[PDB]
């Protein structure tokens, strides 16, 4: 059995080997114990931004500022290239309620749905609410279709951490902890919006990244993926049948050009799983 | 030849608590390798494939308007599994073309129910039979043996061969070298390419040098996926996997990896024979 210093070295070696850099953090939501690799490195968040958008929207609903039943006439994305989902691929206008736009945006990763929600609650207003709740290191700057590893001043706007929506693994772990706190027993988001976001994350349809390594008959996995250019992320919470609960955040960028990298997915998933397993084995 | 490979894959399936119908076919050469490819199983969400085809043919004929806006009652489902309109809380208005996307690519049961109101199960089955497809039954919609859904007498059924034959016909218009209407076929290949449920066979078939277009089916202890892999070098294989598990757990990503590995190894053997024999 490896010691934890040796394990982290093995994991970093494995990531380097597979052409991946990024930000990993796993935390036992009960004890606060955690294990990570570069957990405070800021990367563009791609579709992970849909999480704080959902929470802001849900809070505005609780507040009576937004009506979840409000029917919105949404123009089709008409996108025919690979990747975007839901209304983004529609050919014709659709009419969808705000509550159901939240489902499409958060669970189906539908950027056209997300953009409809951003019209209601703009990026700067989402960010303000996130900051007011005390969340640091999550930026919300632009909607889904506004806009050499990522970096400050990047030529590619979506890879420029000064312009793009960004975050760190730690920022997402802190968010997930706050979302799950109302159901964590034993010795501060409003509980109704938190419960609704947990439900949306459980209903996530994109289960091809970390979910094969985290979901089982004895574990539930609720998560949000993000994929754009050479970015592949996923943040989520695994709930074990024995009651253990871990938040997991993976943000990666690949030095391999190919969009389709199932081996990279398997690798980042194995890394996250080994981090969780070490904490789970930890006395 | 491949007797050894087939025993090895049958062993793996037995050990993993899976039985079913597997078939992989090289769409150019016609060579195929299977495990019980003629065994009838309930098809679950796979029925959305013939439904889409039948609908798309009706659009071509002017019988159905892809632009027609449908007012859809929400599924209001909160338990795990169903997707799209099935999980909506409120009514929504969606065009036929976009219900085809939801049903086929998102596996949305409520969207497929709306499509079945337009082109009902027996009409789909009739259209499929008239095109010459056998061993695909279409009897009920999503929201319609001692378990009803596992009863091959009542349920929508199919065999791996049935699906492989359907996939072959859908891809035929783009297969070069020495019959479905091409527009409906093209639209369905596109819907299949846009499938979102990429957690089953997709990790084993999609790569930088291979595209994977498919449809999954999941119900009770049934776990299926049928699809086509297109290699960067021009090879094309149709893949059909229909399984039922003896293990009662709904969540079995090990079973999913197992069935994907079986299908991939069948393809690999055909790909090797194509290249090297």
């Amino acid at each position: 059995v490896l010691n934890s210093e040796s394990l982290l070295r093995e994991l970093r070696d494995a990531l380097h080997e597979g052409g991946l850099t990024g930000s990993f953090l796993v935390r036992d939501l009960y004890t606060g114990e955690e294990l990570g690799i570069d957990p405070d490195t800021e990367l563009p968040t791609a579709s992970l931004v849909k999480l704080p958008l959902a929470l802001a929207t849900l809070e505005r609903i609780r507040l009576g500022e937004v009506d979840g039943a409000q029917q919105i006439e949404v123009a089709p994305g008409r996108i025919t290239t690979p990747g975007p989902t839901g209304l983004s691929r529609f050919r014709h206008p659709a009419r969808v309620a705000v509550d159901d736009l939240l489902y499409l945006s958060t669970s189906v990763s539908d950027g056209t749905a997300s953009d409809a929600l951003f019209e209601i609650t703009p990026p700067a207003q989402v960010e303000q609410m996130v900051r007011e709740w005390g969340f640091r290191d999550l930026t919300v700057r632009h909607s889904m279709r506004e806009l050499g590893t990522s970096g400050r001043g990047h030529r590619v706007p979506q890879l420029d951490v000064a312009r793009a929506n960004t975050g760190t693994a730690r920022a997402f772990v802190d968010l997930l902890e706050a979302l799950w706190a109302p159901v964590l027993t034993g010795p501060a988001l409003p509980p109704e919006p938190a419960a609704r976001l947990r439900e949306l994350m459980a209903a996530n349809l994109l289960r091809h990244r970390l979910a094969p390594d985290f979901a089982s008959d004895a574990a539930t996995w609720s998560s949000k993926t993000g994929t754009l250019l050479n970015l592949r992320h996923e943040v989520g919470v695994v709930e074990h049948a024995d009651g253990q609960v871990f938040a997991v955040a993976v943000l990666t960028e690949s030095q391999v050009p190919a969009d389709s990298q199932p081996g990279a997915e398997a690798l980042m998933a194995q890394v996250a799983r080994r981090l969780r397993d070490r904490l789970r084995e930890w006395h």
Side-chain angles (χ1 to χ4, degrees), chain A:
Chain A
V1 197
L2 262 25
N3 62 67
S4 275
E5 287 271 66
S6 284
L7 171 61
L8 293 160
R9 281 317 329 179
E10 248 202 28
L11 298 174
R12 287 178 178 272
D13 281 354
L15 290 172
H16 172 79
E17 190 177 41
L20 294 179
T21 75
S23 191
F24 286 74
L25 181 65
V26 177
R27 186 190 290 165
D28 178 322
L29 295 191
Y30 280 106
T31 69
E33 289 295 320
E34 64 186 21
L35 215 52
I37 296 155
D38 302 334
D40 298 303
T41 289
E42 171 179 29
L43 287 88
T45 43
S47 284
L48 303 174
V49 75
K50 291 160 184 166
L51 289 183
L53 171 56
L55 177 60
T57 305
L58 288 163
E59 168 70 342
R60 289 189 81 204
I61 293 174
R62 182 189 73 81
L63 283 169
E65 296 184 0
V66 170
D67 183 354
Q70 178 63 54
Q71 296 280 337
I72 307 295
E73 183 77 22
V74 182
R78 299 188 186 264
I79 287 158
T80 178
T81 55
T85 65
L87 299 168
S88 318
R89 310 197 78 83
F90 272 34
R91 310 303 313 169
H92 309 276
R95 197 207 65 227
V96 176
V98 169
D99 280 330
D100 302 325
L101 286 172
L102 279 164
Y103 171 64
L104 291 172
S105 179
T106 319
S107 307
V108 186
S109 209
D110 180 346
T112 293
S114 304
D115 289 351
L117 293 176
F118 270 130
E119 289 177 353
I120 296 174
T121 311
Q125 179 171 8
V126 176
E127 198 182 64
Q128 179 181 32
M129 295 173 72
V130 158
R131 293 257 156 68
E132 270 157 5
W133 272 318
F135 299 112
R136 350 173 66 214
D137 300 323
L138 288 181
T139 65
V140 192
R141 283 155 172 174
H142 63 83
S143 62
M144 297 322 294
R145 289 143 198 176
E146 296 177 56
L147 315 200
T149 72
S150 61
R152 170 162 79 89
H154 207 287
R155 181 188 68 63
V156 174
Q158 305 100 293
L159 305 182
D160 181 349
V161 300
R163 283 189 276 186
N165 301 322
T166 65
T168 67
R170 178 176 312 283
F172 286 100
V173 170
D174 287 341
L175 178 61
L176 297 175
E177 176 182 271
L179 290 168
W180 261 257
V183 295
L184 303 180
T185 46
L189 304 176
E192 160 77 357
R196 296 190 51 192
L197 194 38
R198 288 199 308 273
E199 284 166 23
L200 289 164
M201 292 185 72
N204 172 49
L205 295 201
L206 308 186
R207 290 187 65 91
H208 62 273
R209 178 157 301 154
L210 264 51
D213 277 275
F214 283 89
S216 78
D217 187 46
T220 297
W221 175 243
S222 304
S223 79
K224 184 74 200 79
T225 62
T227 305
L228 180 61
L229 296 162
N230 61 333
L231 305 167
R232 304 171 175 81
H233 310 332
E234 185 170 359
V235 309
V237 171
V238 57
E239 305 180 15
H240 291 267
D242 68 8
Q244 289 211 320
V245 175
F246 297 90
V248 178
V250 169
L251 291 76
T252 75
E253 47 197 337
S254 175
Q255 287 89 275
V256 180
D259 288 319
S260 197
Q261 283 187 64
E265 318 275 10
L267 172 55
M268 65 186 73
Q270 176 207 297
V271 173
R273 190 202 81 237
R274 294 181 68 185
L275 292 166
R276 189 280 311 277
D277 289 351
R278 179 57 57 105
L279 290 172
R280 185 150 165 92
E281 291 155 13
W282 167 256
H283 77 273

